Structures are given as C-alpha cells and as structure tokens.
Structure 1
Amino acid sequence: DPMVTLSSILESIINDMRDLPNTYPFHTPVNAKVVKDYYKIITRPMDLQTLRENVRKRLYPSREEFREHLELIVKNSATYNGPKHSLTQISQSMLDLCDEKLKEKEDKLARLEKAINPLLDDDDQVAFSFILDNIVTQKMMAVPDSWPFHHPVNKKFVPDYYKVIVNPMDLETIRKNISKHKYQSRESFLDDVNLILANSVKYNGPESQYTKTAQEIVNVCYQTLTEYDEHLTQLEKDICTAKEAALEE
C-alpha cells in the first residue's frame, strides 16, 4: 500500500526532527492549562506527536499536506514566542531538516504520491491547476488593496476574527489547495473564492471598503474564468475521464 510506505518515510523524518537539539518543547501539544492564553493567540495548534499520530491516521497523502502541518509549528512559535525567539529558531531547524529529507527522497516520494492519487500525474489536472494559480496571482492578488485577503488572518492581531468567521478562507489557502490539486472543476474553486467575499460581508459589513475589494476579487475571477471557458471546459471533461479511469483501476 503506497500510503503505508509514504507514512513510514514521513515518520522517519519526524524521528530525525525529534532528534535535533532543544526540540523537546515541540514534541507534544502545548499545555493550555499552563499557557493559559495560548488558544486566544493560536488558531491551529500543532506539535510532533500530533503530526506523528496524523501520519499514522493516514491523513497525509503527499509531502505537501505533511509539510503544511509541520510549518504550523514554526508559524505558531513565531506568533506566540516571536520571530527571532530561540524556540522559533529551533522549530525552523526542524522544518529545514524536513526540507533536506524531502529533497533527498523527492523521486521516491513523487512515485508514491502518484500511486496514491493518479491525478497528480494527469497532464490535464496539472494544466487546470496552473491556470487557476495564474488567475489567483496575476488577476486576483493584483486587485488594488487586496492585502487583507492574501493570507489567513492572524488572531494575534485580530483577536475576535475566528469567533465571527468560523469558515475562513484566503488567497494563500486557495493557492495551497491548487498546489495539492484540490480543484477538479471551477465550481469547487468558486466555492472557496466566494467564501472570501462572504467572510468579508459577515465580518466587515456589506458596504465596507474591505467588502468592495473582495467583490472586485470575485468579479475579476469570474471575468477571467469566462475568458478561458472553452479551455477550462475541455480540461474539466478530461479530468473527469482520468478520475473515472483511476477509480476503475
């Protein structure tokens, strides 16, 4: 089972990171009864034991889903402890070692990832995702004053944001989804795009300048998708054909 093989590789990387100096504070979840404000600051807690248990729960079908959770450890330390704090440097040493190991094993990992999910090897899926990424970076992120929507909100700076917005979305998260080939159709892409606008309506109000900017992001997305309709339609058809042939095997 290539997912078993992949999981063994990821666990070996966790073993190597656990072995780096001074990493113990990242080996297990933060104790929120000692660090009493931790969840008032951090939205997505992560540590190496949770990561390892997730590897064992078969939650990571590729190196990117694993690396994203590992990067939370660093991001969380940067937010809570500070970007230059020794703990953040320590967490970064783990991410750096992971990246070394992923590079060393990149061909084996690619083979496993394609055996787990053949669409990662499908030229139509790849072309479709490439077009979506270009719409995001060249059209949507180019909307003036679109910065509030480029990245997830950091709760340290906006403490009530996730009490109001329980289904958050942002353009970076969409780009990560595109890189993982999450979208096979314009419909699922537009579900996430529209969530950015819906969250602005809810948090900022329908008449706010934030929402006017988010509306322009959505509108330029629709305009650009319409311009590429005939190509995107062909790619979506061919992706459906590939998806059926995978489950057929």
Structure 2
Amino acid sequence: RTDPMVTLSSILESIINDMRDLPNTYPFHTPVNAKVVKDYYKIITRPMDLQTLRENVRKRLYPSREEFREHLELIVKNSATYNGPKHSLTQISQSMLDLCDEKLKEKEDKLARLEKAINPLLDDDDQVAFSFILDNIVTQKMMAVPDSWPFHHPVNKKFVPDYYKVIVNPMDLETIRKNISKHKYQSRESFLDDVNLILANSVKYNGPESQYTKTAQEIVNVCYQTLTEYDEHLTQLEKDICTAKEAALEEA
C-alpha cells in the first residue's frame, strides 16, 4: 500500500551513498566547474555527476533501474572522453558503475516487482493490441467517412476565425492517433470521450445543421458501430489491462 516510486528511490539513493563512499571518487561527487576545467562543456555535452544523479532520484525521474544506470554509465563515458579511456579517474568511475551493478543484481527480484508496479502496462501486449485495433478503427473506418478530411487534422486557425477562442478542447483524428500511439486509452470510454469532442466542437462552432456536423456525426456513429461489432474482443483486452494495473500494485 506504499508508493513504489518512494521504495525505488530509497534503493537508488542508498546505491549513490555506497558509490560516493568508494575511494577517490571525490571529483565525481559534484558537477565539473566550467571556470577551471578547460573546455569541459565543449567536449562533454551530456554531463553527469553524483550530485545531479541524487537530485534526479529525489525528483522521481527514474522509473526503473535502466534509466538510472544509463545516467550513471555517462559518468564513466565522459571520464573516458575527457580524461582518457585508461586514466585513473576513468577506472575510478568504473568502480562506481561496478558497485552499482552488484547492488542491482543483489536486489533483482524486489526491483522487478517495484518496476512493474510503477509501470504495469510497460510492454504489456494487451495494451499494444488494444491500441492496435483503435488505430485501425480510426484509419479504416472513421477516416473513410466521405468528406471527413476537415476532421483529419487540427483546425487551421488562419481560415477558421476565433476557433481556438470558441473551442477550449480542440480534437481531430490525427491527435487521436497520436494519443493511441502513446497508449493514452486503456479502455474505450476515454477513447470515446475524445471522439465525441470532434462532434461536440462542430456543434458549437458550426451548429447542429451544418454539413460539417453531419459528417462528424457519421464519424462518431461509425466509431460506436465498430466498437459494438468487436465488443467481446475489446472487452477481453480492457479487462486484462485493468486487472494487470491492480495486480501490479498488489504485488508491491
């Protein structure tokens, strides 16, 4: 019932404590001082240090060990580039990376359980499959409605005066496809919330009798009809997505 991001961040912060405690890590404790380390930020355009890593941990920027380790490995790579691949400082930065990898392997199982609770739908095939059919509904059914082209992309403000003053939540099929590609929709309800906005917005701006509103109504109707045709399939995916979220949290 605890926040897994907190448990993950305490684990990462204790790794920084141990890395900071290794012999001769002093130069990696704080950001490089541009005023005395010649040309450093010309040569090193992606800098990293243990102070910045600890700040990032406390800001909850790492949802997994991978993102934490990639920033840590930057410390080694930057030392190799600026000091040299065999410089003693690069060997010292490598001793920090090696300790980290021992600590992470040591806590493999608990970290895995926390990572899945922080991101239950990561590489979840039910979510990918659900987004896959939503996208097909948009491209094969909704965009095939005749004269639907004015809804395929955001309204062009230059030709539609005051649109973005009248319409506070604009929506269009390209934006819905972008949301699908980021897996915004975990069930058909939030998908339909955005689809219905295309019609509601045309009613507000064009009125209920407009040819554009009739077209939007057909887009909405074919969306509902297609969700209904695939109800059993979609319900299975929705159920699996929902129960995976909650199961991930329980294993925390």
TM range (shorter): 0.5 to 0.7
In structure 1, distance between residues paired with 2:86 and 2:154: 21
Query: C-alpha offsets along residues 114-142 of structure 1, whole Å, 9 cap, x if unaligned?
Result: 88533131111111110100000000011
CA contact (8 A) 1:43 1:155 kept: no
Aligned residues: 249
State yes or no: 1:138 paired with 2:140. yes
Give 1:153 shift: 1.4
In structure 1, distance between residues paired with 2:101 and 2:86: 20
In structure 2, distance between residues paired with 1:155 and 1:84: 58
In structure 2, distance between residues paired with 1:96 and 1:221: 53
CA contact (8 A) 2:116 2:248 kept: no
Query: C-alpha offsets along residues 88-136 of structure 1, whole Å, 9 cap, x if unaligned?
Result: 9999999999999999999999999988533131111111110100000
Give 1:15 shift: 28
In structure 2, distance between residues paired with 1:21 and 1:148: 65
Taking the TM superposition and a 5 Å limit, the aligned residue runs for 1:222-233 are: 222-233=224-235
Scaled by the length of structure 2, what TM-score is found?
A: 0.55
Give 1:27 shift: 29
Farther off after superposition, 108-117 or 4-13: 4-13
Farther off after superposition, 7-16 or 237-246: 7-16
CA contact (8 A) 1:183 1:189 kept: yes
Give 1:48 shift: 25
Give 1:247 shift: 2.5
In structure 1, distance between residues paired with 2:139 and 2:246: 31
Larger Rg: 2
CA contact (8 A) 1:120 1:181 kept: no
Question: In structure 2, the residue corresponding to 1:153 is in which secondary structure?
Answer: coil
State yes or no: 1:160 paired with 2:167. no
Q: Which runs of 5+ in 1 are unaligned?
A: none
Give 1:159 shift: 3.5
CA contact (8 A) 2:24 2:92 kept: yes
Alignment correspondent of 1:101 = 103
Scaled by the length of structure 1, what TM-score is found?
A: 0.56
- 1:9–1:215 Cα change, 3 Å: farther
CA contact (8 A) 1:79 1:156 kept: no
Alignment correspondent of 2:14 = 12
Farther off after superposition, 202-211 or 36-45: 36-45
In structure 1, distance between residues paired with 2:157 and 2:94: 21
Alignment correspondent of 1:234 = 236
Taking the TM superposition and a 5 Å limit, the aligned residue runs for 1:74-153 are: 117-153=119-155
CA contact (8 A) 1:45 1:76 kept: yes
Alignment correspondent of 2:174 = 172
- 1:144–1:115 Cα change, 3 Å: same
In structure 1, distance between residues paired with 2:108 and 2:163: 38
- 1:197–1:237 Cα change, 3 Å: same
